[PDB]
Amino acid sequence: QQVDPAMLAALQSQPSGVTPSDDWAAAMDRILALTTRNPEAFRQQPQANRFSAILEAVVPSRTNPTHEKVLAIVNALTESKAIRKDEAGLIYNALLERVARYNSTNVQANLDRLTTDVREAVAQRERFMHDTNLGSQVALNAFLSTLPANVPRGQEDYVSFISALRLLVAEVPQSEVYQSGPDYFFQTSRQGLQTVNLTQAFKNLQGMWGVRAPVGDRATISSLLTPNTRLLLLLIAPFTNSSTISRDSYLGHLITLYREAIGQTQVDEQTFQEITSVSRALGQQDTGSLEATLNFLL
């Protein structure tokens, strides 16, 4: 939920009340009675909690940030799942033994360099959540360095389909591709369904890019296509404008018609939101509020 780990290190090892040992500029801010909200609040403390603050502010203490700088590292390693969460009580029990064994002027200044690049040079972790080359760009640029670029029929639409497929894994942060076994896959979401067999799809689409099929043929592709190729073309449909594969290829009978099939449900869901909200507006059997509703929409 947080952005930075060192703020949680500054939340688990700093005093919540204002002390002059660490925040002098706020502890002296209220001794001299110069504060906007509640100014006159330090005279009326007795000699117990005046001298226990007014001595320690005009000459500060000299504490040791060794126990605090390591929590800005041990947290920064468990935020990125390098360590198990069940385990950080051991490594801080081992790093604090480490940097007190080999302590110097250098290591106290070398940890302090390392609690800055886990703050402002950990912006790469903010970066490839957006560009998602975790598993979407550099894991697919091996796939595009695997397919043959010499297709006999349809030389131009072959390199515009994968030009529209690299855009698919780029405009979606959740989708990713990977190497499992001798073939590459592609899931549209983490914790997600609809895994396409990406090797067994472009091998099915090879020798298929030029057909120029007529518009009176529907039930032939049970022995020609494969339903995951029929689902990969479903996942390429919203990111494919009308200028990719124009009109008369058999993919124009597929990719354009898949956008119309998505174009049905992206307005009939708004119809389905109306019907399920008027069954309780007039009084309708909720068991029979979905049987006849779906049959009108399928």
């Binding site: 068991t287 979905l290 049987e291």
Partner: protein
């Protein structure tokens, strides 16, 4: 002599049946609650006694 009643029944040759329809009436091969959207998309264990 004073006496207390004791009545049972007797049935043989056939077995009880409990149909799955809502009003327990046989109005077809499939039933009312059978071709519901429930029980045809979802799974339900039962824990009889």
């Amino acid at each position: 002599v004073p006496s207390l009643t004791q009545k049972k029944f007797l049935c043989d040759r056939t077995m009880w049946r409990i149909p799955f329809s809502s009003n327990f009436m046989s109005m077809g091969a499939l039933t009312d609650l059978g071709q519901n959207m429930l029980y045809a998309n979802s799974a339900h264990a039962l824990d009889m006694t």
